């Protein structure tokens, strides 16, 4: 089984224990590694921190300890406009030019592979992913003649259905790409006046108007679609979302006001990392949504929505029931990587609970 871990650049910028470096990564974790953001100029890929250069060197020999790593680097990303795909993919020309720049890029800082983060395909772009993903699968095919391993096609897709039938052609892509990471938790935020849980494994028999809104339909649907299993991998959230109550109602329904407040840590309104919400805890109350198989707790007028150990160890056996690839994991830098904020004394205890599940048979 694949567990595909994806570490982002501006996680050492964090103050504290906040601070994440690739030399906090456990080698044998995870199978794959992806470096997350890389921008495009001239259209070409390009590295987008200050020191990137020097944090690609760092991830890469993590490879010394365990050969059989591979890592990835990804392009695009939510604070990289998708109407900048949009240009570089609409246009025959500048699209042969970002997938000429790829390969002697990935080769000069050691990556195995290329991840696709291409925040949204709209209607009008459909045609032209296919041929992104077309195209620098071609051009992969062809470096491989130079005598060295073939590089990797992956990309993160939306799990939303309505975002699916919109911008992706799945069937195609799939005989393309070597995986498919499915973003599977987002399916909620302060987007809606109303609380609720973003990564649901199920619909759950209580509420009926977005029964697309669940891991179970997104995984079925891609299923039915035409992406093998064999491709698809399933994305778990180690961050939790945050909201602001309008009022002391906490079940199921409750109003809302906005997200909720920053994190120490993290500080971004709206999202808390695991580690932050292991501290959060002490003086909460948490239930379950037990149809939809997550957690949720509440402090004050603070409303939080996050997996644990739990219900990403059942997030885990569900995609092995099903035969899919193997799982996702949205950010080691949010899982508790110095394993000193979540009681037991583990390092990455979601991303490790996953791990587990999955060496089992
Ligand atoms: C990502 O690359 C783009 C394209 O080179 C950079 O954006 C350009 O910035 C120049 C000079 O800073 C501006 O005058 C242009 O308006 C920018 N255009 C666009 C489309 O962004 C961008 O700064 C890079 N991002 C990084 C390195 O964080």
New binding site residues.
Partial sequence: YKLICYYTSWSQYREGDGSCFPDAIDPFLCTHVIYSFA????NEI???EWNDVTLYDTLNTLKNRNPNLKTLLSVGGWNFGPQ?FSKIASKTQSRRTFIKSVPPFLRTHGFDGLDLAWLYPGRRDKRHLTTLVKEMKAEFIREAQAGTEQLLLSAAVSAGKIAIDRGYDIAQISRHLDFISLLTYDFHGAWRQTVGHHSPLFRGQEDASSRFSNADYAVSYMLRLGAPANKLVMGIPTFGKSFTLASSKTDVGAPVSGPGIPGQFTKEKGILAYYEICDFLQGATTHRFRDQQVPYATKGNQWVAYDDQESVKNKARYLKNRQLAGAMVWALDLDDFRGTFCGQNLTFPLTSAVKDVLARA
């Avoid at 921008?39 to 001239?42: H, K, L, M, T």
């Fill in positions: 921008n495009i100029s001239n390009d590295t987008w900048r």
